[PDB]
Amino acid sequence: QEFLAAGASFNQMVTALERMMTSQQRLLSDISHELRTPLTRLQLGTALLRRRSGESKELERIETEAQRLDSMINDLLVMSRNQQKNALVSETIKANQLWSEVLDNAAFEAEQMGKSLTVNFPPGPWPLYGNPNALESALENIVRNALRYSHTKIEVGFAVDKDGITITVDDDGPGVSPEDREQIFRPFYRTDEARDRESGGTGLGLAIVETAIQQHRGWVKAEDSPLGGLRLVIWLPLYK
Amino acid sequence: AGASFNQMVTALERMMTSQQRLLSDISHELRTPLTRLQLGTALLRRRSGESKELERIETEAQRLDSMINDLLVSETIKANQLWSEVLDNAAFEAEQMGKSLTVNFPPGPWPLYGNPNALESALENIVRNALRYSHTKIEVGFAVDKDGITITVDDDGPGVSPEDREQIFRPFYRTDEARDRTGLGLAIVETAIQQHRGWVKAEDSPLGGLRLVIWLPLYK
Ligand SMILES: Nc1ncnc2c1ncn2[C@@H]1O[C@H](COP(=O)(O)OP(=O)(O)OP(=O)(O)O)[C@@H](O)[C@H]1O
Ligand SMILES: Nc1ncnc2c1ncn2[C@@H]1O[C@H](COP(=O)(O)OP(=O)(O)OP(=O)(O)O)[C@@H](O)[C@H]1O
């Protein structure tokens, strides 16, 4: 329930939260899997139709939309594989252990593109409670996005407080129109500029991030970056 | 620690409702391209009239419509109502693949009690796997008894090594043989059948390929 809360300790509560999420995830991967077959048949139907009556504006529309669904579903299952490839068990972890590998790899990666990665303040031994892999992925996705869309530089900044950790990621690349700053976290949502880019697919990254982070009782925000591009702010509570 | 009771409450609400919100958002996003897909068939039916193919497209679109709708949110059934569409569609698909599908004995009006969709997917996955891995032929056979229904599926394709016959039902697992040419199919099957107090098994097939046997209990 998580409403296991009538009586229970915080830890027990989250395990009940972990129990629910896994079934929600089983549901999503089972439906994702099962959507593929009628879809397969539909495509055999269009194919057979194109053979009998040839190309059409209408048929072309049906075929491209069927391909959109096909693609989304494929990406949904790729995701499902990864989130269940993660065991979920929530544990106490120090911020530095949790994200140092991620940041070091990002420095290596930034260096290859010829770009620069700068850590304004590194993470310390600050206590968190959660799924280590999930929070790691949250940060690699935010920084990999930054490395990709940046023009020359990336910046990462940690901040600690009696209350929590605040992670800030910045890039000097193109921004995100103010309207889209709310929308970028919706699933399958990409900006017209990344659709013009025409590279990559999926718009799950930030949807996965927002979900994980809310599940970890924190929050995420997209803003104008002082470097001129995009700013991502993660806040997570301390565990005591 | 510093937080207001209100901040606690919102943190808590958002925390429990995030996956729900995620799934309902995924559902919304799949629904819009689908809505367009349905007007393409509609506009096409306007332009070029009825066709078997157009009918096919339309019903498949109505199925997608229903399952995406599930993302947002046991009964008594007769085996024949439960699985005939699964089988008819398996026949449609088989004809296109250039393969042959044979039903040695069809299901009758045999009482079952469970989730119709779960059991449908259970059978559909077993025969559709058989259409995939088969070389030329597939055979489906029903059997009834005072106790239950036993569905047997056979193919003439490559088999599965005896060691792997237990593993293939594990989720996200595929044999190394299949890895040269998702792995939820037989996991979905095992789950639904076990949930209906039945069982699933992989064996040697008389056709030379793989044999899958589903047993489900009858209803009182
Ligand atoms: N650093 C960035 N600068 C500008 N826009 C960005 C940046 N990162 C993301 N966006 C915009 O927000 C969208 C959401 O991206 P998100 O990570 O959710 O999916 P994605 O990066 O497109 O694909 P993937 O799922 O493979 O990461 C992106 O397509 C892009 O349009
Ligand atoms: N009829 C068959 N003949 C031979 N091998 C099979 C047969 N059915 C399943 N297998 C093997 O067992 C594995 C389990 O398949 P399962 O249905 O669980 O996933 P899948 O069919 O590979 O993928 P999907 O989930 O998309 O159907 C397959 O990858 C395949 O190696």
Author numbering:
A (entry chain A): 216 to 455
B (entry chain B): 221 to 293, 305 to 412, 417 to 455
What does the study report here?
The sensor kinase CpxA senses a variety of envelope stresses, including misfolded proteins, and transduces this signal to the RR CpxR through conserved phosphotransfer reactions. The CpxAHDC structure consists of a homodimer, in which the HAMP and DHp domains from both subunits assemble into an elongated central coiled-coil region flanked on either side by the two CA domains.
In some crystal forms, however, only the C-terminal α2 helix from both monomers could be traced in the electron density maps, because CpxAHDC has a tendency to establish interactions via its central-core helices, leading to the formation of dimers-of-dimers that sterically interfere with the positioning of helix α1. In all homodimers, the fixed CA domain is sequestered by the DHp domain in an inactive kinase conformation, with the ATP-γP positioned far away from the phosphorylatable His248. The catalytic cores (DHp + CA domains) are very similar to each other in the three independent crystal structures; they can be superimposed with r.m.s.d. of 0.9–1.4 Å and display an identical network of hydrogen bonding interactions involving key functional residues for ATP binding and catalysis. This highly conserved active site geometry in distinct crystalline environments emphasizes the stability of the CA–DHp interface in the Michaelis complex and lends further support to its functional relevance.
